């Protein structure tokens, strides 16, 4: 059971956005569909809910005009339309139904160009543990999802929050394994940038060939 939300929406200020929430293994038919907003490093604001039986909506007064909730039972999709976007609308939007939360859509309100990331392997310089890295540079908008060995490598991972400079984000991630593990076993950085439909699998190669 999952509620499907696109990872990102990049919309110019003043324009409108229609965010979708698609039931996967869940049918939007009886349970209210709730929408919530979460600003960066802040709380959670309930926007409103929609009854999928009659289309009746209830909004928080501050979202009455800005937000419009709809539901398409035939497409198994609930929608949140937000009008005349401003910088204050940039946030993570969650849809919730029957206690199931969607992964959230990061809404970016900007006229800046969608840019796919460059993905750089960070192999160690030419003790018992070894640290490898991955540099994800020059992308827009947020987010990027990073995994190691398709998520099989989860322990000893540090993924550093992205930093914005001159319209582009940069992030990095380190992975620490036993010295005997690498380069014997393959270590690959898997980067996904939903806004540009980019999926990059970058293998970490030793700086010097294993033969010297």
């Amino acid at each position: 059971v999952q509620l499907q939300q696109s990872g990102a929406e990049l919309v110019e200020p003043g324009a409108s956005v229609k965010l979708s929430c698609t039931g996967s293994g869940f049918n939007i038919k009886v349970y209210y569909v709730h929408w919530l907003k979460q600003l960066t490093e802040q709380g959670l604001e309930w926007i409103g809910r929609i009854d999928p039986e009659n289309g009746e909506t209830i909004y928080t007064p501050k979202f009455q005009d800005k937000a419009t909730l709809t539901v398409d039972t035939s497409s198994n999709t609930a929608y949140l339309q937000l009008s005349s976007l401003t910088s204050e609308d940039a946030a993570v939007y969650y849809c919730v139904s029957s206690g199931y939360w969607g992964q959230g859509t990061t809404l970016t309100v900007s006229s800046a160009k969608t840019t796919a990331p460059s993905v750089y392997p960070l192999a160690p310089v030419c003790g018992s543990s070894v640290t490898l890295g991955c540099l994800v540079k020059g992308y827009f908008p947020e987010p990027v999802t990073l995994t190691w060995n398709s998520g099989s490598l989860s322990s000893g991972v540090h993924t550093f929050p992205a930093v914005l400079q001159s319209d582009l984000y940069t992030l990095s991630s380190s992975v620490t394994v036993t010295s005997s593990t690498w380069p014997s076993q393959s270590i690959t950085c898997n980067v996904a940038h939903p806004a540009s439909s980019t999926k990059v699998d970058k293998k970490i190669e030793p700086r010097g060939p294993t033969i010297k």
Partner: protein, 217 residues
């Protein structure tokens, strides 16, 4: 409407000791049926909020019994009998008596034994150099407490420009912090100098941890 107020501020809690998180409602959460419509959620970085407690007294399925809540009808606390590493994140109180509203959240931070950072230096990749760029990266990993200073040196000379520092959220397994320091140069600028050094100053030692490489080597 009902406004939920939580102080975002709380002191770091020693691992394995008890913690209390306060919340107040602008109107009573007690209903005429005798039920208190108070909820507690935990949100971990990059994840949606997870339900902990429903209607004040009930644990959500699979939630450890270390979380309990009680109160007056307008002032409540979430009690953590003993704080574990996995408890880090932002705790929210919420109510569903009048629509749905949430508190501003309270981030739980853990105090653990001091730990020196493990420092690793990374020269630019062949791929970045081929594009004309040159980022030198230093990871200052699994340290405690959070405060740390990084110093970059190019041929023995300090460099402040083009340095970007990013801190991770507190680790859910060992309660440490890590930091990434990136010095970005052009391929040409990078090739004009030999020695690249990153020095980590942390309270665990008066001497910095020094990691260096020579571009020529």
């Amino acid at each position: 409407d009902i406004v939920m107020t939580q102080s975002a501020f709380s002191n770091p809690v020693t691992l394995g000791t008890s913690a209390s998180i306060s919340c107040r409602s602008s109107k009573s959460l007690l209903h005429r049926n005798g039920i208190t419509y108070l909820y507690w959620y935990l949100q971990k970085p990059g994840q949606p909020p997870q339900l902990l407690i429903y209607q004040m007294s009930n644990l959500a399925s699979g939630v450890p019994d270390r979380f309990t809540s009680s109160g007056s009808g307008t002032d409540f606390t979430l009690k953590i009998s003993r704080v574990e590493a996995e408890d880090v994140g932002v705790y929210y109180c919420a109510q569903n008596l009048e629509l749905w509203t949430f508190g501003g959240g309270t981030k739980l931070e853990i105090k653990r034994a001091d730990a020196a950072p493990t420092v690793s230096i990374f020269p630019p990749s062949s791929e970045q150099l081929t594009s004309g760029g040159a980022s030198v990266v230093c990871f200052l990993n699994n340290f405690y407490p959070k405060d740390i200073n990084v110093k970059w040196k190019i041929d023995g000379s300090e460099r402040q420009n083009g340095v970007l520092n990013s801190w991770t959220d507190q680790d859910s397994k060992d309660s440490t912090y890590s930091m990434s320091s990136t010095l970005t140069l052009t391929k040409d600028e990078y090739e004009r100098h030999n020695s690249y050094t990153c020095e980590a100053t942390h309270k665990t030692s008066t001497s910095p941890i020094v990691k260096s490489f020579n571009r020529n080597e």
